[PDB]
Ligand binder design. Structure first.
Ligand SMILES: Cc1sc(C(=N)N)cc1-c1ccccc1
Ligand SMILES: Cc1sc(C(=N)N)cc1-c1ccccc1
Ligand SMILES: Cc1sc(C(=N)N)cc1-c1ccccc1
Ligand SMILES: Cc1sc(C(=N)N)cc1-c1ccccc1
Ligand SMILES: [Cl-]
Ligand SMILES: [Cl-]
Ligand SMILES: [Mg+2]
Ligand SMILES: [Mg+2]
Ligand SMILES: [Mg+2]
Ligand SMILES: [Mg+2]
Lengths: 225, 12, 225, 12
């Protein structure tokens, strides 16, 4: 596309500049162009990809919720039309991310740290599609998260931040999307407890990384119990 | 809507 | 353009929804389409136009400053290229606003409240062009602000919030753009004092509106003295 | 850069 003529390294550099400038649409477009160079992404580059699209879809989700709420309360065509406009834009972003994962980030990801990361993203962006959808979208989210969980439990320690963030998101999928609040609560507790028992093996910096995400599991359990 | 904690930027 | 097929009233309704959703690019596009219907704007509609574009250009200005600062410190082509990209987008937004004012909002604005409002915007968007530029752009800002000031001093009381916001912005133009800090300080003081002396004529709600902007003049004087 | 107060939304 329009980033085809820019060097991979220049795209990565500009993604980091756009992050500093809080220009997340640009950041996402730079990272899409880097992915489309066809090379695998490093850990830092995967994180740039995810942060970029998470910020873009987050603005869309927030706006969609405002509009959906106004629409529900109002129940002219304008509120429905504009909610649909934002909804379609959100679906388009989700489709773009899923497209990058399917062509060809996941199939070329052999290491656990990269394969789990991408499968988690796949679960997340189908979850964002499910928020606005439906049964098949939910099963697509579930399937991606489950594959990621199975790999993470065999190949990563229970304190691994990627594993922790995956379990966090899968628990929210259970609570809100799958209407399985007991599964959500069970997952959050087991994940928290198995991480707690492994903190003693960590350096100070790794301890900080793992406990930050453990605090998110705790925040959810507090809202859920 | 009440939004629960998920990984990464809290951008919504 | 792409809003040509939508009703004026639907564009205004959708601008207000977009504001609620914090979707300011959409808000600006809806208001541009309403302006291009060719009818004059009401006070509320002028405010929707200004708030929309102020939010869009504000994000651009903030990003431009981050990038300019990185570029100055760095002094590859990437930082310069990306600062230029954001700069061009900012100029494009300024050119779009100035285009709406020139075709044909200002020439059809006969009442003081509407003519001052538009001339203030003209000053503001040339000021935003000046921030990134140059002598002719600065004189264009100065000329628009001066015409607005002359009308406001003849036709509006000194507490009028439009008059106050104009003087506030013209004072910042003097301080930062025209390198006339003494003129800036003099203007802020005289404007503040003449408003103070007229507050006794106001209702509680009008008093609140006027003192809010007077506090901004005071904030600037505090930074400047 | 130090930014001074101007009218309306403080959007930068
Ligand atoms: C974990 C994150 S998040 C991030 C960002 N730019 N937000 C960058 C990185 C990272 C990862 C591995 C090595 C160097 C940096
Ligand atoms: C963080 C953990 S672990 C755990 C357990 N009972 N295994 C429970 C909690 C928790 C439960 C509710 C509210 C806040 C925290
Ligand atoms: C002063 C503002 S600001 C604003 C906005 N939507 N931000 C709307 C209005 C307004 C003006 C006159 C009459 C009704 C409303
Ligand atoms: C608000 C006003 S009015 C005025 C005057 N000397 N006429 C001075 C100030 C002020 C000056 C510096 C810092 C804070 C406020
Ligand atoms: Cl629409
Ligand atoms: Cl660029
Ligand atoms: Mg739809
Ligand atoms: Mg139970
Ligand atoms: Mg230039
Ligand atoms: Mg002096």
């Amino acid at each position: 596309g329009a980033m085809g003529s820019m060097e991979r390294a220049s795209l990565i550099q500009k993604a980091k500049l756009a992050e500093q400038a809080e220009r997340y649409e640009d950041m996402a477009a730079f990272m899409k162009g880097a992915v489309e160079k066809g090379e695998e992404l490093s850990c830092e580059e995967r994180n740039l990809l995810s942060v970029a699209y998470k910020n873009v879809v987050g603005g869309q989700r927030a706006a969609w919720r405002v509009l959906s709420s106004i629409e529900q309360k109002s129940n002219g065509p304008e509120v429905r039309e504009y909610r649909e406009k934002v909804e379609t834009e959100l679906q388009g972003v989700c489709d773009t991310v899923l497209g990058l994962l399917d062509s060809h980030l996941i199939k070329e990801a052999g290491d656990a740290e990269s394969r789990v990361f991408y499968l988690k993203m796949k679960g997340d962006y189908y979850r964002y599609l499910a928020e606005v959808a439906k049964k098949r979208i939910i099963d697509s989210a579930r399937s991606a998260y489950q594959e990621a969980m199975d790999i993470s439990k065999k190949e990563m320690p229970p304190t691994n931040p990627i594993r922790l963030g995956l379990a966090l998101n899968f628990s929210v999928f259970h609570y809100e999307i799958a209407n399985s609040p007991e599964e959500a609560i069970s997952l959050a507790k087991t994940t928290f407890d198995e991480a707690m028992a492994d903190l003693h093996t960590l350096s100070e910096d790794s301890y900080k990384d793992s406990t930050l995400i453990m605090q998110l599991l705790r925040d959810n359990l507090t809202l859920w119990t | 809507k009440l939004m629960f904690k998920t990984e990464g930027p809290d951008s919504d």
